[PDB]
Amino acid sequence: HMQVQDLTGAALDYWVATAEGHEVPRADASGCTSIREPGGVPTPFAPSSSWADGGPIVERLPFAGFERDGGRGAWRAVLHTFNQSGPTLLIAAMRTLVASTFGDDVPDLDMA
Amino acid sequence: HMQVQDLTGAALDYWVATAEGHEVPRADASGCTSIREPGGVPTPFAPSSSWADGGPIVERLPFAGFERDGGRGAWRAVLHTFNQSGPTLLIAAMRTLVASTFGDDVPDLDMA
Secondary structure, X not given: OEEHHHOOHHHHHHHHHHHOOOEEEXXXXXXXXXXXXXXXXXXXXXXXXXXXXXXXXXXXXXXXXXXXXXXXXOEXXXXXXXXXXXXXXXXXXXXXXHHHHXXXXXXXXXXX | OEEHHHOOHHHHXXXXXXXXXXXXXXXXXXXXXXXOOOOOOOEEOOOOOOHHHHHHHHHHOOOOEEEOHHHOOOEEEEOOOOEEEEOOHHXXXXXXXXXXXXXXXXXXXXXX
């Protein structure tokens, strides 16, 4: 198993694709790819680092709050109330998402 | 004058370009454009609606918090502590930014 709090990069992206019901998600050293839209094609998916991907999730999912004391350092996301932290807003958000879907731990398949 | 709380779209984008020290910012019905990087060219800038533009600002500026009660409805951003609300996370963030730079009101130049 893998501690969600320690999850990052394409591995975290992969688990967000999974929690989001994406088809054929996979992850590589180069990045995570998935099929978001049924009858689609594999497209890059980096919600933990690309605002274009993580942004819309943050607005859509029931996130209720984000906080970074003194406007500096780590962020801590809250959802509807299931919670986790990270160095970035996206990372904290994504880990919180994954955690509320799969808990503190996540299976360790090879993602390719 | 224009109430910042009522500021939206390319008008809000324009005032974010301004608060951010962008060169030759302007706004049109089609969008806001600016020169972010000295010795640059006019590029679209929609931090209030595009995650790619607003995202990095949110992470960089000293935002200390965001909250949307019950993970639904309006958002309220907090900075370092200068505060305003909006229907989206980006809008709330951007208005908060503009407000701490220029206050509750903003001049009304034609933006082109």
